[PDB]
Design a protein around this ligand. Structure first.
Ligand SMILES: O[C@@H]1[C@@H](O)[C@H](O[C@@H]2CO[C@@H](O[C@@H]3CO[C@@H](O[C@@H]4CO[C@@H](O)[C@H](O)[C@H]4O)[C@H](O)[C@H]3O)[C@H](O)[C@H]2O)OC[C@H]1O
Ligand SMILES: O[C@@H]1[C@@H](O)[C@H](O[C@@H]2CO[C@@H](O[C@@H]3CO[C@H](O)[C@H](O)[C@H]3O)[C@H](O)[C@H]2O)OC[C@H]1O
Ligand SMILES: [Mg+2]
Length: 347
């Protein structure tokens, strides 16, 4: 499998949803053990999923995930301690809408990280400590975290995670940092936090790619730039969106562009071979680049195992039929998978 083909290069990972991590599906258990040597929880360790609005914890799924990784001796990545998404507004706000104090929020962060990173200390090899702190306008993201705490929200999260599990490989993770602009903004942020003494070991590039964009040359500049910070580079959430893109439509469509329309969902009956070919070539191009820079890269994780489970079926448009991953809806390897193997088989 892939994990073996790529053994001398980097870990090969997959995000697992709660149904898969339950271990009920023997077909998937077999596939995962063959193909992947790292796993990430797709949702179950996110603050708002693990805890309710009153802060109460329910460990069923997160424990199942860690049990699965332990059973199969898989490298496990915690995802994610501090993030602005999938987190209750109650963490940040009084019921009247007003923000709580920086001190009150610090206490919550302290409890959350001490509890969550503590429970799995030594079991999870790595943590996404902070996710998506740079906004797409290249300023710091204007989240409640940042508005209340300033950049201490980042500094404190890493410091805390490091005190709780000193052996964990701590990462900052983000999307679109493959691209000029956000790349350099991220470098500058991390640089200044590093000079402040923040513990950080790795840099996660999500790798939510389109079938065409961004180009290999852009991703290459990112691998190089982030490695220069003395950080290990991980590709954390790989997928390739093969469906009509609505990201850059004219202003008249700004609000309607996320609506379902049949023309935006052209492959409900299957992905035609010509698109399989393009998808395979795109993955081949990407993994050629990763191999080239294997000295800088610790891991390539896919954001799912097979196409049926991909979040891209419902994002950014609900109810589409996307084909972003290496295994199809019948758990069979797609052409892309064989191209990835051949890169290694043939030297
Ligand atoms: O919650 C997080 C999500 O918000 C995040 O969504 C990402 C948002 O940005 C997306 O990147 C888009 C990709 O499309 C680009 O424009 C295309 C350029 O090529 C043209 O051929 C095409 O017509 C355009 O539409 C756009 O510049 C770029 O910003 C990214 O894919 C999403 O994943 O994902 C992470 C979540 O946690
Ligand atoms: O409506 C909710 C869904 O929107 C939710 O979907 C999950 C959203 O998060 C995705 O993972 C992120 C993908 O992008 C980046 O890589 C992030 O780092 C990831 O965390 C999941 O894949 C989706 O399943 O699920 C809950 C539902 O209530
Ligand atoms: Mg272990």
């Amino acid at each position: 499998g892939l994990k073996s083909a790529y053994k001398d290069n980097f870990l090969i990972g997959a995000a697992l949803n709660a149904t898969i991590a339950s271990g009920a599906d023997e077909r998937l258990n077999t596939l995962i053990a063959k193909e992947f040597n790292s796993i990430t929880p797709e949702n179950c360790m996110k603050w708002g999923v693990l805890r309710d609005a009153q802060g109460q914890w329910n460990w069923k799924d997160a424990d199942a995930f860690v049990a699965f990784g332990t059973k199969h001796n898989l490298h496990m990545v915690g995802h994610t301690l501090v993030w602005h998404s999938q987190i209750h507004d109650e963490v940040f706000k009084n019921a009247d809408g007003s923000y709580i104090s920086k001190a009150a929020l610090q206490k919550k962060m302290e409890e959350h990280i001490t509890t969550l990173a503590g429970r799995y200390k030594g079991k999870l090899a790595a943590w996404d400590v902070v996710n998506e702190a740079v906004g797409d306008d290249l300023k710091m993201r204007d989240s409640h975290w940042y508005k209340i705490m300033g950049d201490d929200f980042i500094y404190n999260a890493f410091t805390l995670a490091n005190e709780v599990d000193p052996k964990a490989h701590l990462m900052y993770n983000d999307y679109n940092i493959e691209r000029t602009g956000k790349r350099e903004a991220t470098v500058e942020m991390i640089e200044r936090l590093q000079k402040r003494g923040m513990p950080i070991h790795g840099l996660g590039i999500q790798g939510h790619l389109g079938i065409d964009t961004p180009p290999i040359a852009e991703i290459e500049k990112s691998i190089i730039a982030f490695a220069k910070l003395g950080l290990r580079v991980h590709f954390t959430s790989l997928d390739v969106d093969v469906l009509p893109s609505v990201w850059e439509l004219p202003v008249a469509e700004v609000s309607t562009r996320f609506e379902y329309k049949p023309e935006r969902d052209p492959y409900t009956k299957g992905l035609p071979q010509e698109m399989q070919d393009k998808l395979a070539k795109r993955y081949e191009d990407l993994f050629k680049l990763f191999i080239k820079h294997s000295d800088k890269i610790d891991r390539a994780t896919f954001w799912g195992v097979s196409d049926d489970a991909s979040w891209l079926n419902g994002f950014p448009i609900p109810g589409r039929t996307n084909y972003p991953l290496l295994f199809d809806r019948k758990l069979q390897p797609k052409d892309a998978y064989f191209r990835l193997l051949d890169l290694k088989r043939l030297e």
